[PDB]
Amino acid sequence: QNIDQPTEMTATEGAIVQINCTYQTSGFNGLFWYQQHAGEAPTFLSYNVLDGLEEKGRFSSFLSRSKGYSYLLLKELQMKDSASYLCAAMDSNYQLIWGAGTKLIIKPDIQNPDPAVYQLRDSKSVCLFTDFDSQTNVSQSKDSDVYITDKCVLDMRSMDFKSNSAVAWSNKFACANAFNNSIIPEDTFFPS
Amino acid sequence: RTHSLRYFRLGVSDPIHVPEFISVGYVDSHPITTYDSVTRQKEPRAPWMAENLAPDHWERYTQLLRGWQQMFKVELKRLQRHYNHSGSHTYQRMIGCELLEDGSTTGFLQYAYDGQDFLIFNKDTLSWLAVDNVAHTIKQAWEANQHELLYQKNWLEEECIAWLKRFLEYGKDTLQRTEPPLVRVNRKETFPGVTALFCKAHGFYPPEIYMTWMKNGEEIVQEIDYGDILPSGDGTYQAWASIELLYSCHVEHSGVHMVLQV
Amino acid sequence: GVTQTPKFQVLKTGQSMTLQCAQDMNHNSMYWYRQDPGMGLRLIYYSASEGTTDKGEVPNGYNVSRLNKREFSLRLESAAPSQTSVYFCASSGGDSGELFFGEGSRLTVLEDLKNVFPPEVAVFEPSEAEISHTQKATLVCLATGFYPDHVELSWWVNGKEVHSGVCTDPQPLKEQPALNDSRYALSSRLRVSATFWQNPRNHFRCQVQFYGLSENDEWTQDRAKPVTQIVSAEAWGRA
Amino acid sequence: MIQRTPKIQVYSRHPAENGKSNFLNCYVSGFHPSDIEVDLLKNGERIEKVEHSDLSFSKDWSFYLLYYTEFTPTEKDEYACRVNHVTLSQPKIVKWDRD
Ligand code: NA
Ligand code: NA
Ligand code: NA
Numbered sequence: 001q002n003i004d005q006p007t008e009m010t011a012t013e014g015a016i017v018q019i020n021c022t023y024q025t026s027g028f029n030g031l032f033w034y035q036q037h038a039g040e041a042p043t044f045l046s047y048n049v050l051d052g053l054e055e056k057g058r059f060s061s062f063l064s065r066s067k068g069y070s071y072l073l074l075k076e077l078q079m080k081d082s083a084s085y086l087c088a089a090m091d092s093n094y095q096l097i098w099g100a101g102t103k104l105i106i107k108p109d110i111q112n113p114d115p116a117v118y119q120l121r122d123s124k125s126v127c128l129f130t131d132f133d134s135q136t137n138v139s140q141s142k143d144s145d146v147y148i149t150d151k152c153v154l155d156m157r158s159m160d161f162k163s164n165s166a167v168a169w170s171n172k173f174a175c176a177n178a179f180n181n182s183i184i185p186e187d188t189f190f191p192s
Numbered sequence: 193r194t195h196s197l198r199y200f201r202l203g204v205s206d207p208i209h210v211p212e213f214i215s216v217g218y219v220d221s222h223p224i225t226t227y228d229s230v231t232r233q234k235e236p237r238a239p240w241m242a243e244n245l246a247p248d249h250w251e252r253y254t255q256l257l258r259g260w261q262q263m264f265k266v267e268l269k270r271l272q273r274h275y276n277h278s279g280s281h282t283y284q285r286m287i288g289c290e291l292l293e294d295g296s297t298t299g300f301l302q303y304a305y306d307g308q309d310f311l312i313f314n315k316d317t318l319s320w321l322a323v324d325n326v327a328h329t330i331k332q333a334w335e336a337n338q339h340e341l342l343y344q345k346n347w348l349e350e351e352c353i354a355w356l357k358r359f360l361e362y363g364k365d366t367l368q369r370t371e372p373p374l375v376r377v378n379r380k381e382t383f384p385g386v387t388a389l390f391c392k393a394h395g396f397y398p399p400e401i402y403m404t405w406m407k408n409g410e411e412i413v414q415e416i417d418y419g420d421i422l423p424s425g426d427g428t429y430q431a432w433a434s435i436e437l438l439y440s441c442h443v444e445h446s447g448v449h450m451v452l453q454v
Numbered sequence: 455g456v457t458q459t460p461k462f463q464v465l466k467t468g469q470s471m472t473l474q475c476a477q478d479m480n481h482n483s484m485y486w487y488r489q490d491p492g493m494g495l496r497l498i499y500y501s502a503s504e505g506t507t508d509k510g511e512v513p514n515g516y517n518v519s520r521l522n523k524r525e526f527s528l529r530l531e532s533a534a535p536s537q538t539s540v541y542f543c544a545s546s547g548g549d550s551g552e553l554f555f556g557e558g559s560r561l562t563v564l565e566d567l568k569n570v571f572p573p574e575v576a577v578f579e580p581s582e583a584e585i586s587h588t589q590k591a592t593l594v595c596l597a598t599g600f601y602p603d604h605v606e607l608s609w610w611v612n613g614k615e616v617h618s619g620v621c622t623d624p625q626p627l628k629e630q631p632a633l634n635d636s637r638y639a640l641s642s643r644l645r646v647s648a649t650f651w652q653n654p655r656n657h658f659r660c661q662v663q664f665y666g667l668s669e670n671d672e673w674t675q676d677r678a679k680p681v682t683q684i685v686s687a688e689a690w691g692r693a
Numbered sequence: 694m695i696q697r698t699p700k701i702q703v704y705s706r707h708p709a710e711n712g713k714s715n716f717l718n719c720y721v722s723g724f725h726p727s728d729i730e731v732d733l734l735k736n737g738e739r740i741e742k743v744e745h746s747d748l749s750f751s752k753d754w755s756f757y758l759l760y761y762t763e764f765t766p767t768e769k770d771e772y773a774c775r776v777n778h779v780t781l782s783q784p785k786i787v788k789w790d791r792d
Contacts, residue, residue: 098494118581152621191583259502307725343550
């Protein structure tokens with residue numbers, strides 16, 4: 001009849017996150033967790049049917065049948081853990097009732113923030129807001145014919161370096177006022 | 193009062209003309225459901241099941257039973273290959289639970305091959321007891337799936353009991369009634385110098401009945417002959433106990449004690 | 455595990471479509487689901503074993519065929535815009551058995567194909583100010599004006615696909631947010647070191663695979679037929 | 694392979710009295726495998742109006758059935774249950790002991 005899990009959760013890289021799932025079903029034959037990366041298929045993570053906690057590497061799955069409650073616990077969080085997590089409860093007739101999924105966002109640990117807005121020219125130009133701390137939020141354009149994408153995390157694996165960025169562009173518009181609708185750091189570098 | 197719910201499966205390889213697969217459910221001695229490989233439909237076998245379960249119950253379990261039927265066929269094929277058996281062989285399953293008078297519960301899951309115990313599930317150790325080396329091969333494959341073992345323990349201890357309580361309420365006017373026995377004692381000289389006393393009971397429900405013969409107020413040492421508890425065909429039962437000869441027949445049925453002095 | 459086709463499809467309202475699904479895991483049970491934003495997976499039809507099928511929660515506008523033990527096809531009799539979705543085939547061994555999902559099929563059902571466009575792709579070279587300030591160089595790729603949202607962007611450095619230093623927006627933006635048939639834009643970044651970008655022999659290419667119309671689709675417009683195609687932009691490193 | 698021959702019990706629903714309407718039961722149980730043929734006989738001839746339960750399952754893996762018919766016993770009429778099973782080389786006719 002009903003299953004609930006949070007729409008979204010945000011936690012920091014290296015930390016721990018607990019994704020709760022509560023269900024009210026007509027009978028019970030097990031609780032499943034699935035991982036679904038953006039644009040990919042869901043893949044099985046865990047199954048619980050008796051009470052307790054089962055550990056599988058960095059992931060643990062808990063069940064309390066009397067509370068109709070389960071959690072998926074992810075430890076030592078990595079950027080690759082960014083995905084949607086689906087919980088599904090099997091009822092008395094072996095039918096699954098699916099939660100709407102929890103999108104998990106991992107905030108990178110930015111060691112040396114260097115916020116700046118750069119102008120990039122065509123190989124018409126783009127504005128790149130980059131190297132800001134994970135606490136900064138990028139707001140949508142609201143203005144006409146100005147396109148602003150949300151923050152994206154890139155990982156330069158060999159340099160063990162991560163960075164946040166957002167892109168703004170228009171055919172109307174300057175990099176000095178591109179991110180005016182966002183609360184950006186006071187020391188953001190605007191090259192002249 | 194003690195009640196039980198059980199589902200049976202019967203698979204027959206290479207059957208005559210006879211379904212390849214049959215599944216029947218019971219509450220106590222009452223059939224509640226039926227499915228076979230000829231109808232390919234799960235249907236009620238009690239009017240109190242038909243009146244209380246919506247068409248979606250029968251539609252969904254018809255689909256599940258079509259899957260379980262296919263699995264049963266394949267499993268029986270593998271057993272025959274392991275035993276190097278040809279021709280027609282049988283495979284049976286029984287799953288169920290009991291809800292005792294004191295509120296405690298039992299759960300059981302068992303398989304048979306050719307009508308003999310084959311594999312018996314132990315839900316307390318989560319293991320299968322095997323009768324021979326073929327059953328041992330199956331035991332090893334089944335015990336490798338820890339999730340399935342836990343699912344079976346949950347089903348026996350929680351789901352089965354919840355289904356049983358639900359069906360008990362549906363069938364309460366049948367299952368929870370009491371029809372007291374009609375008891376009589378007949379005396380007759382049989383072979384010269386040998387008098388037999390028969391204590392006979394009929395018209396009772398539930399079928400569970402205790403009948404004994406007592407001498408001067410104490411239990412006998414001499415042999416009592418017991419009649420089976422038999423269905424009379426109208427939903428009630430009959431039984432008897434006899435002895436050769438102060439004798440009295442003692443009957444206990446559903447919390448009521450009766451004494452017939454001869 | 456589970457093989458389903460096609461990955462993408464554009465359909466006109468009223469057109470017929472069959473999705474294929476095959477599994478080689480010897481599973482009796484097979485399923486067809488649709489996934490839509492903000493809600494749990496919804497079963498369309500299922501097949502408990504070979505020789506049987508039954509309706510799920512949302513069977514209207516669909517039918518299925520359990521062709522044999524391996525294959526279970528899903529048919530859209532008369533495509534409707536409400537059927538725009540991501541479809542997943544799955545299989546299970548039954549009882550406590552988990553599901554194994556196919557790769558997913560993204561279907562878009564349109565009233566007509568007149569707003570279908572491939573992307574325009576452009577690469578924006580790293581800022582001299584970024585290079586001197588950080589000793590890093592970020593390339594930006596923009597795929598713009600495409601419709602429907604059926605694209606896969608990838609980065610190729612010296613003819614080899616790269617994943618390190620890459621971030622592509624998980625969702626495209628709407629270029630005309632007030633329009634019901636808004637076209638889309640998508641950005642991606644590739645970040646390298648200053649010296650790597652500064653090498654004149656390093657070659658950078660942003661590739662956008664667009665999934666549009668097939669050969670069988672009729673096209674009567676003056677502009678080029680917006681077929682499934684790759685659109686790319688390149689840049690060489692500079693000293 | 695262990696095959697189990699049927700137990701066959703023939704009895705009336707109520708204590709029998711000649712000239713009083715009753716039901717004749719034939720309870721066939723404890724047999725394995727399941728294929729079986731049961732007929733109720735009146736003076737060696739098969740009774741046509743005979744009702745029966747569906748094949749039933751025992752916990753010891755054997756099977757049972759109940760066959761019955763409405764009848765009025767008489768001193769002259771002989772009633773019997775005729776059963777055939779793979780364990781029997783010929784049908785077994787079990788006579789009613791007249792209660
Ligand atoms: Na929900
Ligand atoms: Na349909
Ligand atoms: Na015979």
